[PDB]
Design a protein around this ligand. Sequence first.
Ligand code: AMP
Ligand code: AMP
Length: 292
Amino acid sequence: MIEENLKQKIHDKFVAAKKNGHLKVTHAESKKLKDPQTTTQYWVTFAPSLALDPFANPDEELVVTEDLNGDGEYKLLLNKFPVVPEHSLLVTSEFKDQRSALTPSDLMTAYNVLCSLQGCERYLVFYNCGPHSGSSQDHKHLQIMQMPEKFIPFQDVLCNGKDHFLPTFNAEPLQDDKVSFAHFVLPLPESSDQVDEDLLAMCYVSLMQRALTFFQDLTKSYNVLLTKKWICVVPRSHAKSGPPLMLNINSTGYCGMILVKDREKLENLTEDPHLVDKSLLQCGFPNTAGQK
Ligand SMILES: Nc1ncnc2c1ncn2[C@@H]1O[C@H](COP(=O)(O)O)[C@@H](O)[C@H]1O
Ligand SMILES: Nc1ncnc2c1ncn2[C@@H]1O[C@H](COP(=O)(O)O)[C@@H](O)[C@H]1O
């Protein structure tokens, strides 16, 4: 059960922290890129400045709510070093570990926050899980950030024209065969009324099956991305990319959202955006789909 006008409180809360220093907004410039080989759309943010247990007792100036739901499980914090204004942490009240799986509560809580903020705005929710996921913090936390105003992540196109399903013997999760990386995507019911705790648990664990098999033949690492339109699970072999790019990558980069700290890199992606693909390959596993 989400707090009322939770947007306003996040907005009300951020405008302050920015003013008094309790958080600091890195400047960035961002541009869209399209993959000529794969058709995938890339949103590339440039922040050269970045080239230059806090969730236990975070500055209260940073704490939107002490308990998100009626339950005493979650606070809501503001990322103290935002690139996208207002990026929020969903944080466990009593410490849990980031290696820990997501629970029916976690997903619905987060989904309900999606529904609060989304009352052309769009929001992304992700979880970096494991040494290789892009995680910098062990206190379990989920992330919520605005996605880009005009941007079409490939999950969308793979997900449109396809009504919600839980995999049927004649059906797997949805997986784009064009791209380099293994990933798993399921469509969600459009009106949030068709969406509840048990449905996501199904979705998540299901996805989690296919995901898990990428170890049993490195400690399990992966990304979860969740939007009102779909849920997606990515298995992760590395945190940072290979030799061309040496990019650090978290859940966002698997809807195509990339954060680079130096200009040459920005240029090289611009010259050849498909390198992004190879990077998600380097941090991922090779793709499967088109098969069973
Ligand atoms: N794809 C992304 N787009 C925008 N901000 C991001 C992205 N990935 C991470 N961040 C945030 O940007 C800040 C810098 O992260 P880092 O790039 O690891 O130095 C942190 O607040 C991150 O959570
Ligand atoms: N003291 C802090 N208070 C709130 N957020 C923080 C603090 N230190 C780091 N972060 C953010 O915590 C997030 C960690 O995400 P990740 O590195 O994917 O685990 C990033 O958005 C960081 O900017």
